[PDB]
Amino acid sequence: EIPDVLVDPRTMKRYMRGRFLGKGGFAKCYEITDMDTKEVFAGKVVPKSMLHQKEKMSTEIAIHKSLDNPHVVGFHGFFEDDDFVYVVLEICRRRSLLELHKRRKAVTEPEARYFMRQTIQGVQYLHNNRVIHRDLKLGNLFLNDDMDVKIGDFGLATKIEHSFEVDIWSLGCILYTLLVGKPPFETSCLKETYIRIKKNEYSVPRHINPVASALIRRMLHADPTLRPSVAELLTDEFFTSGYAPMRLPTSCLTVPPRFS
Numbered sequence: 001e002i003p004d005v006l007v008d009p010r011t012m013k014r015y016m017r018g019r020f021l022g023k024g025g026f027a028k029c030y031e032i033t034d035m036d037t038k039e040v041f042a043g044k045v046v047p048k049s050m051l052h053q054k055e056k057m058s059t060e061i062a063i064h065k066s067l068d069n070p071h072v073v074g075f076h077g078f079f080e081d082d083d084f085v086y087v088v089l090e091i092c093r094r095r096s097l098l099e100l101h102k103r104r105k106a107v108t109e110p111e112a113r114y115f116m117r118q119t120i121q122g123v124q125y126l127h128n129n130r131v132i133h134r135d136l137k138l139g140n141l142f143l144n145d146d147m148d149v150k151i152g153d154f155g156l157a158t159k160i161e162h163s164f165e166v167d168i169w170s171l172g173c174i175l176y177t178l179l180v181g182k183p184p185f186e187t188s189c190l191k192e193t194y195i196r197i198k199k200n201e202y203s204v205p206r207h208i209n210p211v212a213s214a215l216i217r218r219m220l221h222a223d224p225t226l227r228p229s230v231a232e233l234l235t236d237e238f239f240t241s242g243y244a245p246m247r248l249p250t251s252c253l254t255v256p257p258r259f260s
Contacts (some may be wrong), residue, residue: 002045006032006086015043020186022023023197024153026050031091042077044087051143060155063089063131071121071122073142073152092150094143097174100253101138101194106181108256109209113244115141115169117234123167124230126151130160133163136170144160147248170234172219179212184220211237 006015014035021029021042032043051057064075081108097115101108107115118143126133129172133154140153176184184202187193196202204213215238223225228236249257 002028002030002084003081005035008077008086010079011077015041015086017043020119021232028226032088034209040091040146042087042089042091046085046087048083048085056155057085060157063157063159064154067126067129067131067154069122069125071118071149071151072125073150076180089152092142092144092152094141094145094147094250095177096143096252097141097149098138100143101177101181103254104252104256105179107180107252109212110243110245111248111252111257112175112178112212113239113242114246114248115149115178116171117239117244118173119151120171120230120233122149122151123171124234127167127230131157132164133157133167133170135176136167138174141174145250146259147250147252162224164230165227168219168227168230168233169224172216175212175219176204176216178209179216184216207241210234210237211241 002017004017006017007013008015016035017030017031017032019031021031023029024044027044027046029043030043031174032041033039034041046057055064055199064073067075073092076088076090078085078087080086117207119136123133123136131154133151133156134135135153135156140151142150144150184204185193185196187196200220202220204216215228215236218226218228219233245257245259251257
């Protein structure tokens with residue numbers, strides 16, 4: 001059983017475990033409140049029943065703690081007792097882009113622009129700091145109350161001192177999924193999915209904006225050298241031409257926006 005009050009030897013702060021937020025593979029996340037300052041965080045609780053695996057999460061914490069960007073999930077500290085390891089993170093109350101995708105399917109072009117711009121700006125920060133995420137997907141593009149994108153889950157991330165263009169590939173899949181309403185490669189069979197990826201077998205429909213489809217084709221290019229860098233992503237025609245809202249209402253979680 002996870003304690004009601006989570007305490008740290010280091011900061012010696014008291015975090016009251018509150019509202020359940022969800023399970024992530026092996027971790028169980030809760031909305032935690034600092035009993036002193038009353039600031040709300042997301043407490044990631046991972047049991048010592050798991051954790052070879054203890055070295056993997058230690059690398060995740062090492063990479064995550066150094067990061068500080070408005071488009072990346074804020075790391076506020078980590079601690080442990082004899083039973084559980086606790087990670088204190090920025091609170092994202094509006095789930096992720098995966099829950100939005102399931103409810104919305106294909107989103108409008110201005111929405112994809114908003115979501116992609118914010119995500120790429122986050123990936124740009126990562127790449128400038130020599131961090132490769134390696135597991136970019138709708139599921140770890142979290143949303144706060146203001147509909148701001150926060151990149152999280154650095155459990156497969158690496159830091160350099162394949163390369164950066166695997167993240168660009170993943171962003172091509174995300175952009176495809178947002179505009180088309182379904183993943184470009186993913187199928188019920190995992191073996192078939194891998195074959196499609198290897199053969200670079202996918203099809204962007206003809207009706208999709210030529211400007212958007214052209215960008216997707218470059219991001220998902222078989223030759224990783226011909227893929228655009230994170231820097232030239234922002235300056236693409238897809239972002240600079242059409243309508244690009246600076247804000248999105250929370251209604252976008254369920255319905256298309258009216259822009260009022």
